[PDB]
Assembly symmetry: D2
Homo-oligomer: 483 residues x 4
């Protein structure tokens, strides 16, 4: 099985390839042609040229219709996409069928719709001579959008950037994660089959440093680099595009907290924190790795969660009742297990998990770990401050509202937070004081694609979603007419 680049309307190989490994069993699923500097350039130039082609001449209605045909094209091959995401990542088949693929289809449809309904502004003004003037704004394509995406929700996060870039009439050069290159390749087939003009969408495979990713960010032909990944990678990219003063949008790491107040519906909160800690084996940026529970309910909470966690089925993506699959890679398991050990050395009490499960089959050749819960660590422990990106949470008691607010906020990260309380005043009062981009109250990972989405501090720069995407992926130009 092979995954090729898609450049100027053609699938092409490269002088080098790398292995794509199924993390369920460590088996080789495909070879992936790594694009080189020359190929990246060819992609960017083709995207620049595609801006003056038929793509640039499409009305907003016609463009939106073609974007819906991309969406239709994915729906037509729905189960192939599901198989592709599962293979790369080992995620449960039910998760891919209900979350990953549907949300990616929704990204195209929503931004196609937004593009059709969006408008701009008119400002009337007085002048010295009494005749006045008119200022109006227009949205134009920004140009070539470089897209660099992670492996946690591969197609979803890929299409989260590609859909509005295309909806705004831009062209795209996109580099998916080396760990999850398959669904992105299928998408390039859908684009091609949908008749998306050559050069409008370009897919380059490869790595970051000294590979396609780096090359893309250094290429002077792009107009913007939108990125989702590690905070340190974002800082690196920001330096790379600095001489070109490229527009940037970064969605970076988090060490997200959940907070359970004494008046929470305890069962729902336990359920809630279970989902937020262990979904996708805790490999979601929005996962809660720190949890604060009111002292009066702390023991009862940790008990209930231990039970639920131990009922979780860790196995095959298609196994009956499965809840967790493997981590994305062996290298990633190494770093995660390394934190498991670091936690012990730091004084943690291992409430559950803290190692790898035993299968006595091919899965032992995979990259599984157990859902883990810690207690007993201090606020300054590395395991409570640094992002692990595994199925783990530490639970800590608290006593006062203002105290826990301060403790949640005592982070260099600021992506998201979940609060559990049944009290009206408390919900709104506490929520507004959490220094993050997204707060959920009595739920987790509910996403409305119209809302602004982003993080504060090291967790990012800018907002995307709804009008914020329509703004970022466009040139906003002001035209002033003297009358």
């Amino acid at each position: 099985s092979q995954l090729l680049n898609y450049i100027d309307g053609n699938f092409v190989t490269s002088a080098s390839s790398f292995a794509n490994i199924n993390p369920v069993n460590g088996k080789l699923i495909s070879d992936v042609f790594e694009a080189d500097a020359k190929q990246v350039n060819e992609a960017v130039v083709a995207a620049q040229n595609a801006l003056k082609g038929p793509w640039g001449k499409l009305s907003v209605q016609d463009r939106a219709a073609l974007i819906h045909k991309i969406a239709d094209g994915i729906q037509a091959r729905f189960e192939e996409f599901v198989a592709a995401e599962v293979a790369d990542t080992g995620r449960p088949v039910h998760q891919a069928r209900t979350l990953d693929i549907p949300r990616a289809i929704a990204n195209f449809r929503t931004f196609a719709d937004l593009a059709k309904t969006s408008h701009t502004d008119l400002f009337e003004m007085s002048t010295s001579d009494g005749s006045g003037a008119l200022n109006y704004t227009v949205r134009k394509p920004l140009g070539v959008i470089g897209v660099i995406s992670p492996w946690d929700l591969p197609l979803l996060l890929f299409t989260w950037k590609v859909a509005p870039a295309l909806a705004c009439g831009n062209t795209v050069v996109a580099k998916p994660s080396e760990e999850s290159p398959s669904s992105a390749t299928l998408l390039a087939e859908v684009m091609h089959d949908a008749g998306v003009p050559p050069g409008v969408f370009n897919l380059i495979h490869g790595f970051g440093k000294d590979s396609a990713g780096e090359f893309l960010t250094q290429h002077p032909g792009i107009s913007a680099l939108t990125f989702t990944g590690e905070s340190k990678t974002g800082s690196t990219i920001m330096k790379a595009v600095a001489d070109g003063v490229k527009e940037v949008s970064f969605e970076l790491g988090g060490k997200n907290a959940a907070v359970v107040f004494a008046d929470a519906d305890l069962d729902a909160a336990i359920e809630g924190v279970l989902r937020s800690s262990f979904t996708n084996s805790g490999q979601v940026c929005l996962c809660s790795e720190r949890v604060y529970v009111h002292r009066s309910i702390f023991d009862e909470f940790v008990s209930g969660l231990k039970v639920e966690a131990e009922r979780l089925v860790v196995g095959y993506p298609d196994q009956d009742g499965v809840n967790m699959g493997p981590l994305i890679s062996h290298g990633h398991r190494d770093k995660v297990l390394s934190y498991y050990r670091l936690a012990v050395d730091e004084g943690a009490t291992v409430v559950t998990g803290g190692g790898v499960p035993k299968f006595n089959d091919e899965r032992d050749q995979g990259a599984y770990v157990q859902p883990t819960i810690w207690t007993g660590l201090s606020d300054k422990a590395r395991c409570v401050t640094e992002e692990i990106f595994g199925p783990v949470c530490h639970i800590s008691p608290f006593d006062d509202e203002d105290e826990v607010i301060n403790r949640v906020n005592d982070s260099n990260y600021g992506l998201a937070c979940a609060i559990w309380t049944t009290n009206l005043s408390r919900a709104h009062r506490v929520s507004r004081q959490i220094h993050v981009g997204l707060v959920w109250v009595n739920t987790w990972y509910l996403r409305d694609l119209r809302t602004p989405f982003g993080g504060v501090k090291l967790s990012g720069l800018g907002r995307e979603g709804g009008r914020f995407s329509m703004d970022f992926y466009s040139d906003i130009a002001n035209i002033c007419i003297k009358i």
Copy 2:
């Protein structure tokens, strides 16, 4: 005369001072205390702490009333502010009385008003359990805003940043240009006398590299760096805040064109290009330095502009019919005369100017140059592509509409453009195809503070003005309530 820093409600001196020179006659105006890294730290920490004080507890209405009070304080000392801008820069007194100071006052009033009238968004959504969810957004202070500003319109551009920063409830550490520190210092006095709480507004004097400016961009305590200056400086600052992923807003250089079509009102166009090329002695980022005139009117346009340029009075700020003062500094003049030499070397015809005026009085010790017009250079000439920031324009003929649009856009910059035509379709057809942030038709430098403002390519990153400022200087936070 001495200009002090203003840190945490106190005017403070520093270990070193530097010279503020009057560009009219080369004489010493004042000594300015240069903030060291320790003082910059002190300012940032005070700014952080002020967010937690009385300032942080003001209602939006009370915060707006206080900002209007700052404006009233400037107005109450209007002529002192006029005297200060004039002294630092040599700008004509009438310009300072009609443009610089009144627009600085308007910055505060406009953003105080916007702060009172702004609101956010409500999104309703359905959920699988049929109960639904509410998503609402809020605007919070981003935190401590670092402001670094240029010398071309000192108080105007300085308050362009500080006014929305404060209006959004942020605290500020601001570093004005070393060439123009005086009006900023008066502003600090207005702040103090208006009762702005200690730490909310902090003024640090100094240079950029290895000085106050650099130290500000490096301090981990800021949340954003908003900047107006050279494109190369912007790139440096982008790199400098990259590790901390600070929000950034950049308004950078330009090589702005004016286009004069055959159907222009010729005399209005001549007058318009005269203003756009020579206002503030060509030292405004929005100035035209490239001009394209239709072949049929080229000779007549050049002859007309030569006459008007030679009528310009270059002299004292309060001299009777004065139009132009000097350049900001001897150092800047050295750079400008170097470009004058380069133009001749590149084969230009000097239609007028090209040197320095001889006054035979104290002004000869100052930094004056002549308004200058070139013809005959190619589009590839350095003098036609690089920003000079002096009172100069090159004029070139054109034949065809699409041709001239391409020539305008063939630039690494894209700040502004001015177009002269009496034709309804032409005005709208052409302006939308110019790759810049701002197009004027039949005027120049009309600014409505509600409009988005900024540049493309090397001319900047992001937009400010109106709701764009209200969004940039705020944390936009999303709160999601499961019902």
Copy 3:
């Protein structure tokens, strides 16, 4: 051959029927069942109850999907709808295929899209106790919308009300014009086949006074009456719903002007005024019946228009080069002919037309009149001030700009106006001074569904289109939470 009412999911007949006549040849097309008062009540009650059924429980996304299905259902029977519109009205087949039916479909698609993308507002406020309060708004269904539509663009205008009513979650009782009932009836079939729940859409046929129309306006069960028709009918309806304080939205009559300045593209303006005066045989509310032409081009304009009018092909809807069909009915023809005679009695020169064409075939049994052009009437002539709604225009010369603006605005109507000029300043300067809801410059009948649309003075009440429709067809509720 028989057109039934559609009430609570069932096609039902009535106690009496009336004749639907083909205006091409006077032949009977169908019998139409006239809804009585009890059936109108039945419709309103069924609509009230459907608010509480499954329709009320759809998410906005599901509701929007269903409205797209309705659009898809029209598209699937495209030619059937074309045949229906043509049969009732005699409009050229090409017009129905290109204007009428596609725009009816677009109505549904556009408001479905707007429903998905619309959101509401969040207001934060301070309170004495320092904890604050949150105000947010929501859009809810207004209730049962009563829709009463005219015969000029039957399906287009019908769906212009029905689409946003359904898009906003309302239920509907709609009464199309007795002159054009066929396409509305076909629409009811499409609703049925698409599975729109019973009672959500209800179609009642009949007349105005003492018939289905009046009864609908008097029913206390509706929440709003949206109407398009003559101004006097609007007044009648305003009184009828007064006791109920029903929400109202009126698009009434006009006497629209076209103005041609000396610098207009003469050929384009002649072509434009030809379309604006004679499209749909002058039976569009937006048609020009008053034309003002600058004196220097008056004779040339009139001579050119006469030539183009006499080239117009008046005939069968499927006659190969047909431009115009008949008027809507013999009764309407008699009214128009009465004005044709009044014009002559008022002193008009008949430049062309002024009577009925002789076909020497079945068309002579239809309701055709000639495209007519008048000159020589004063601004006080009844034929110059009262809406005729036939294929007619008076042409008058003018000399001054403020003069012609005055004569344009000197009217009790204010629907629309078209101005022809190539001058940038004049276009914007004059347009803003015309007291109408809509000005076109160098075109006519360009409609963007996002824009506000309506009249001033006798031409209407309120605005529809874009968010104005989303607001009118919705309850806007404010919810204020003390924290």
Copy 4:
């Protein structure tokens, strides 16, 4: 004593007929008020039309905003004079006038002047067949002459609530305040004059409704809009009256508002809140609760608690120490309210407290006071539970189920406002969104942000005002489409 004149075309003028202004505290004559006739209303409208073509029409948005801030400044500069005028007319407690009435009226002008400065309009690009495209842009122009007709419950607040956005949008105004409260509007005319507002821009006409200035105004072909606040019946009458001219209309009408106290409410706070919402301005605000529903489990405790607080209410002089309630607006209004007091007894209400008039043994016995009143035991169908009384009264009823009480609140021909008391997050949002009214408060009452849309549903109104909705209503929204 005092005299109140009309203000037409920059001049204070008298009339052929006058009527009396009566202090409701003691029944004493305050002033004579000149009733404008048909001729004078016409003179006002025509002056307002001409004013649109004068210097007023030529001001920039910024200069017009500055002038409106000058009007607010003028009211502030005469603050205590305005307080005295609202109080004299209405008998409202001086503290209410000083903290609610007068400051809000000043805030009305300031808010809409600011909105005027910040507001902008829309740009729509579109594709065309020939591929050159087109641009649609919208502008806001003044609508024209706005007729304003206001009520007596919050005289200057509600008057300026219409007059401020009208002027902010560049309209001219002919305004007719309630015959029951003509004073503060007359003082506003003085402020306008002194502030240099051009003649014809603001015109003040005094009188009644039917066969007087109010009716004449609604009938004049010269106005562009009629904005109105008052009884629902009057709303309908006026809607018929402007129908022939198809005038723009905005109506804020009657209500029979409910308060709901759920079992998880902060009980003491709910008692306090319902006390305020039922008896503030002696129950004479359109936003007052007159129907109350309390969960069965806390019903008795709630009622006994409210009884205690209602009986500690001080009824008396507007400047009396700790006064909570002044008199009703007039003896005529009291007749109406007492009639409902009787009706409640006849329908079988238990009178928990009040139900009569207090005995003062001084001049206040010549005024129009009644007692704060609480009823129980009436059915949802009782007239006193369904008809707007507009006095200091509430009926309290128990309920058991959430959906039940939601249906009971909504079972009304009115739909102005509702207040909900609960400490539950889910409940506040779930229940609020189901209440068929324009405004719901949770755990409070009568908080107003001037930026929010405001209006009623069903008989309680037509349209919305506030923020962008006032900017839209008081403006011509015109679309200009340019083929490129």
